[PDB]
Each structure stands twice: as C-alpha cells, then as structure tokens.
From Swiss-Prot:
Pfam families: Lactamase_B. This is Metallo-beta-lactamase type 2. CDD domains: BcII-like_MBL-B1. It is found in: Periplasm. It comes from Bacillus cereus.
Length: 215
C-alpha cells in the first residue's frame, strides 16, 4: 500500500495496521509514521522545512490525527532539517543530548535532547524504544525499535541491500560503526523488519550487509 502525494516527492507505504514508512526524495530518505491512538509520531521528519511541512500535512490529512512527536535519529541536515517546522507547530522533537548539541553547533534549532542511551516512550498504545548503540554513520546516530512489532528503524547506521558502499563518511566512525551494529544485533536478537536510512526495508540481513560494507 503505497500512497504518494501530489508531486510524488513524498511516499508512504504501510508496514502494518499502525506503522508506515515515509520516504522523501531530497536520494530517498526513510522514516516512520506511527499511527497511534494519541496522534501521529514520526521517526525522522525530512530534508528541510518544505518537505517536512508536506509530510506532516499529508499524514495528518490521511490519518485524521495530529503529528505530536518526532524522533530525530541524528543531527545531519537531512534529519534535523525540518526542525524549525516541528518547533513552530509545537511538535515535540525528541533526540539525544548529543544530537541536540550537534544540531545547535551546526546552527539548527534544538530538538529536546531528552533521549538517553535507552529510552522507552509510549504514545497511546504504541511503544517505542530509542537506542544509542555507539558511533557509526555519525557519532550521534540512534536506532528506533518498536517492540510490539520487532521493527527496527536503523536510520543511516543501516545500509540497504542496494547500497554498495557507506555513503557519506565525512562524519562517520568507520572503526566503531561495526561495534555499534553489533550492539544493535545483540540488543535486538529477533528482528521482523529493518528500515534503513535509505532504500528498501529489509531484515537482520541489512545489519549484516552494513558490517560487510565496513570491511
Ligand atoms: Zn547522516
Ligand atoms: Zn538520512
């Protein structure tokens, strides 16, 4: 079930009753839309305010609920870029302290810096755990786990099958990235789906693929 917007710039495919993948062309970036009984929760918004606004507006209309929260999985422009939109609309922008301070350092408005190494959030019925596994794609990258579905949002820590290299490594810690991936595999031993930062949803295999890319 793939719902595109007017432009085809934004696309959402359903994973289950309450979890959707959002994908925007900026190179396609993935995030999640969590349809919860208390509103919509995004795992990552989009590249900039324009797309973040279109994203929110598309999901709010479709699901007939407000976006209440977003989880920002790292401070890169393409993840933090819609922060202005989130803050001015009173959408809670969750992040680790490190992501927030990187955002501030890079001139972005700050997300909450409320996430710890492991943080468990609950939005209505929807359970969400955020996990900082260590440095990888960036020093601050986190993953997001939906324990009710065993769905892992890998963000840019995790490369899709189609990714034949590590992408942008300017901010990366290619020595620690393998350990960070291991930390994810150790923590989540039973994974139903993994959503990479870009590309097609996969499973545990994407974490193995990322490991190989790191050799
Ligand atoms: Zn990045
Ligand atoms: Zn990304």
């Amino acid at each position: 079930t793939v719902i595109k917007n007017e432009t085809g710039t934004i696309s959402i495919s359903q994973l289950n009753k309450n979890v959707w993948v959002h994908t925007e062309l900026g190179v396609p970036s993935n995030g999640l839309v969590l349809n919860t009984s208390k509103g919509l929760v995004l795992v990552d918004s989009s590249w900039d305010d324009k797309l973040t606004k279109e994203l929110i507006e598309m999901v709010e209309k479709k699901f007939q609920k407000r976006v209440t929260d977003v989880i920002i999985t790292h401070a890169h422009a393409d993840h933090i870029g819609g922060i202005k939109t989130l803050k001015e609309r009173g959408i809670k922008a969750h992040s680790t302290a490190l992501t927030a301070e990187l955002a501030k350092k890079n001139g972005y408005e700050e997300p909450l810096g409320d996430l710890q190494t492991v943080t468990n959030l609950k939005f209505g019925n929807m359970k969400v755990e955020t996990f900082y596994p260590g440095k990888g794609h960036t020093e601050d990258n986190i993953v997001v786990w939906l324990p009710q579905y065993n769905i892992l949002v890998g963000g840019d820590l995790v490369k899709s099958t189609s990714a034949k290299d590590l992408g942008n490594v300017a901010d990366a810690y290619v020595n620690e990235w393998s350990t960070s991936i291991e930390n994810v595999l150790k923590r989540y031993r039973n994974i139903n789906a993994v959503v990479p930062g870009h590309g097609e949803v996969g499973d545990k295999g994407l974490l193995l693929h990322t490991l190989d890319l790191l050799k």
